[PDB]
Amino acid sequence: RERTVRLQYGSRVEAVYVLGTYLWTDVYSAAPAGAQTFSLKHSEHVWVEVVRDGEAEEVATNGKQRWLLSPSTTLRVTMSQASTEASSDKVTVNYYDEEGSIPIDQAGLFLTAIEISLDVDADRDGVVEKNNPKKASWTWGPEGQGAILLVNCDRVYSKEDLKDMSQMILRTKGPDRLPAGYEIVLYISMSDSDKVGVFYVENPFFGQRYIHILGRRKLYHVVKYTGGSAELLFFVEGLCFPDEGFSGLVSIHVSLLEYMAQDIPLTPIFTDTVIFRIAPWIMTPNILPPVSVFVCCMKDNYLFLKEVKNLVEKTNCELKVCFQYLNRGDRWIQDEIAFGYIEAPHKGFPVVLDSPRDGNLVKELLGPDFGYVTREVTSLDSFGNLEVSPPVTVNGKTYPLGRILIGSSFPLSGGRRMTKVVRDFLKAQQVQAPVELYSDWLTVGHVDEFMSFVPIPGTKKFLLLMASTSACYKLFREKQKDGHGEAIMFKGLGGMSSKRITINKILSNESLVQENLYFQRCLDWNRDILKKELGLTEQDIIDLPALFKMDEDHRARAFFPNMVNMIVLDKDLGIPKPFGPQVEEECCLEMHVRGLLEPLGLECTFIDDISAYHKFLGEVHCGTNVRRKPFTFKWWHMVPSRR
Amino acid sequence: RERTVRLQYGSRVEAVYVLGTYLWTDVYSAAPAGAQTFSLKHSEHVWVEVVRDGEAEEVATNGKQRWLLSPSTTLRVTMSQASTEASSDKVTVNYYDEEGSIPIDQAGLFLTAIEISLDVDADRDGVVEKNNPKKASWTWGPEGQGAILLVNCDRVYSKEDLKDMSQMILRTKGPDRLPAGYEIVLYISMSDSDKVGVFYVENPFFGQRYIHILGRRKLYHVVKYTGGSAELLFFVEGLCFPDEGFSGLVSIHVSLLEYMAQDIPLTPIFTDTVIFRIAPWIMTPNILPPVSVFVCCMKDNYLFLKEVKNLVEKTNCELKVCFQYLNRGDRWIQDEIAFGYIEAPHKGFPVVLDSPRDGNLVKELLGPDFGYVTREVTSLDSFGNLEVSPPVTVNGKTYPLGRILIGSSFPLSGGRRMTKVVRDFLKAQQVQAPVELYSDWLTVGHVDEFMSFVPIPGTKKFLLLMASTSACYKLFREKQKDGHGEAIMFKGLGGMSSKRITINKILSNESLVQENLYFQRCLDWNRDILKKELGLTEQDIIDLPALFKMDEDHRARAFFPNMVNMIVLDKDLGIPKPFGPQVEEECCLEMHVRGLLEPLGLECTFIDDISAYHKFLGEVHCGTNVRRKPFTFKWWHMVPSRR
Ligand SMILES: [Ca+2]
Ligand SMILES: [Ca+2]
């Protein structure tokens, strides 16, 4: 970087010189009008070239050389090392008249050279490197660079409270003090002031207290210069995730400012900039290793608790049991809480999004391990309506973190849709490239009512599981042909007994057959979008028998529990107990599902969440959610499409 | 694209088949419960494979082959040609019981195959190609693809009124009619509804009238299907330029919708999408060939008009003379009007931005050749505060259209800044990558007060011209040393005479010397930013003598006319007449400027815009602006950095 400095008449101009720049210097303007030629001297650590019309020549510390005075003859002045107290760094120009050799005047430059660098971990290893040449930019991918910031998800300071934030270090080198008239100022834009905050210890002699120096209402902070080789440590937090109007990028600047006079702005002499990207929220698909299983239910649903405990005991997972709250639905751990994570090179942790039904009065429950983000509406707004696929490749395009799936209605339908605020949030994270499905044919309207994903044991592959009414009707027709038409469903649910629902009764209900043909069309429409957007073929899909009843809005609710919404712990699947028709004293739905899944090495455990209620009307009163290990793939290594 | 279709019990399912897809077909669900095996027949133009667990085999039109009935045994159905009236396209499945060979039932698919494609000129040649595989995406650069839209800048319809818009053609092929229950609908999102509009002729039998079918408040339009090979022509306009919240991309969709039943949404069977990018507004730098010169001034400034006419007569340019208006400043053609252009593959034209001082009451003046865009505040908001550089390369990064330059204040200064709305507009155009300079040290605050660009004749190169107070003081000191100190300025301006301003008087004014040293610091700060951001060296810069007086706010106004703001017509420069000190009956400022410029082949004509006012207080009462030919480089071939 070249900087312009002009000599002053009969004077020694004084300037700070910042390493990494050089000075092009006008000697002509300072010359007496009657002057003809000039000569120069300079100190050992100042390098001086005379540049005449683009051509440069190095000049000795004390030579006698003379040059003609011209506007087109200038100096180039360079220094490679910072000044100390022992330094006298200078360049002096002597001016001569017609009959020369005794100088008629002189003008000079007294220089104080300093190093100033605002440093961050741009190469993404967790350490703050010295002056990364790419630190002012942010690029995606394996070879990409620039620093990463985490949102503070827990919400005078202690250093321990700042332990998870990003480090930024102002590194300087110079003599005891800067010359009179200079200050160093750290600053941000008004726009970024609600995106970021910065902390440091303003007064280290009096203690370790970290104070917030940049953020809301504070756009700049003057930092004291200390001599020698010094480092000032700053901690930086993100205040919010990327969103519709915010890309995720923020900048922080330091400038060396020169005082000119009263009522005149200070001149930025040198400015150094770093950029951060705020890490996106990332959802964990069912193929990732489970860590903890969270369940909610009424205290007295004993079979559910006992059977979930037994399932989790087959695994290395921990079980966390939660009960119902006044401000939350009966499924809240599934519907109101979404499990995800954030990661930077220096740290990462799980982050839960919370959208309580009635608002807040759970952070206590989840524990200190989690970041916790709460929102400031239809049933499609539930996190039961959010899923994420395993990593996929679609027509050559890789989605290494998978793709988020959101239930919606058809564009021209006038139907329900997840709120724009949430849709825009998910889109803005960019790394999960969301896809909208069709859930609005369901009364509740959640994608988790019709689909899930499971890993295939012993492989890196996975299956899409789809609810299928066609599979159920085929199974029931087969059992009827076999002489089982009188087989009864809902055995043991006393509140269903008077209905006497059998295979015969279901198959002869004409309107119900027609409703379920239509629901199968809805399922198939989704099947096609999923195959297209996830790059799946029919060999990647298993159909589980399902059956629905229609409401007045022509929307579906489960006739018997939806088996597709299951607890996935690697090879072990907790599957809602269907209460299907009994054939030879086994549920034909359970037997059919085992016959589909078990050959693939999946182990099925049926979990009864409805017996405590004595009947099933389409509503489930329990919920589960799983904290999983993050992807091994670093999100910053992705190269998302541009917007 | 694979689509799921299931056969219906004892029936022939009827479906439309869209070319470019294929059907995976469930035959199992339609089978009688007591059925064991199936066979199939199909017509000549329907291709059928039996797929058993991923492995496919082609099946003849009439074979006798049988297969076991299984859920995992399906059909894949393909058609390569659209149906006609002569077609009977079908596939029929026969079902058999245990002791087989006479069918116990049959289910079938009657197919109507059609071609449906929404086509645009995505390969950017001006013609609408058939179904560009990339039409649903928009990519930058030489190899980039996707269609381009112009903003309608002039603001039942005639085709002639639509002549400049983009064409979009729905191409179909099929029989006389679609089966009952299907319609074709063109549509856009609510979000895009204020960005775009679409026109077509709804009733061609009754005339050519083009009606607006998509846009504000109209999100969809049902289009009538005609048989055979048909094309429907649509014209598409952009309603606005890219801005802070709008990337410039818009999408248009067509879907084939299937009627299900009353009070149920229609099912999109097939959807085709095209994307357009709205062309950005592009500013023309001084190096581009001049077409027309526009000037404004009071009717009686005769010397200005005479001398501008003489200048333009040396060129092939046309002169357009404008006078003053009640709602506009005296410089309005310079300050209130910015000349730029837009371009698409099929058309382009010049587009003026207008920001009248007092608002609108000029479009008449500019003529039908121009698009005209009017805005819906400090002096920094003027277009005199906007410039654009010639094409530059900066550290390997090419800016083939140049970079826009905007005057501002220092970040921490609390000074004036161009309004966010305009800054965000210029940034959003993306292709000119704007740079902020420091103009707020000037009373008026316009970059055109201190800098300009000129081409170097006979070359592809250019110069940056900078105002320099140091150059003026050096010249005046030289003339004083030569015995010319009593040389008077402002000769012929009677309202200046009593001041008796000479070289001596200027040089001995101590406070004025100090003010101008400070203004030179301001100029040099800009010099450094320009060298950095435009990739310039000192050999690319010429300094023109300038002098300023300071106001109460410590801001600069011209002491004598600023020569840097000049009319640039290739080699010919109209330069404001400075009225400098006369030495040997020539202005020493004019002679000095000629000595700088003329050796490079530039021809200087000094234009007197101030004599009609009898004095000069720092304000100029005339303005000029030039319509130039657009760049040869197509903006869509640029690859701008991502945001
Ligand atoms: Ca590092
Ligand atoms: Ca074309």
UniProtKB/Swiss-Prot annotation, chains A, B:
Q: What is its EC number?
A: 3.5.3.15
Question: Membrane-spanning regions, if any?
Answer: none
So what does this thing catalyse? L-arginyl-[protein] + H2O = L-citrullyl-[protein] + NH4(+)
* Residues the entry annotates as binding Ca(2+) 1: D121, D123, D125, V127, E129
Q: Where does Ca(2+) 5 bind?
A: A338, F383, L386, E387
Q: Which InterPro entries match?
A: Cupredoxin, PAD, PAD_C, PAD_central_sf, PAD_N, PAD_N_sf, Prot_Arg_deaminase_cen_dom
Please give the biological process terms from Gene Ontology that the record holds: cellular response to leukemia inhibitory factor; chromatin remodeling; estrogen receptor signaling pathway; negative regulation of chemokine-mediated signaling pathway; negative regulation of lymphocyte chemotaxis; substantia nigra development; transcription initiation-coupled chromatin remodeling
Record-listed Ca(2+) 2 binding positions: N152, D154, D161, D164
Where expressed (tissue)? Detected in keratinocytes in epidermis (at protein level).
Q: Which Pfam families match?
A: PAD, PAD_M, PAD_N
Q: Which family does it belong to?
A: Belongs to the protein arginine deiminase family.
Question: What name does UniProt use for this protein?
Answer: Protein-arginine deiminase type-2
Q: Source species, please?
A: Homo sapiens
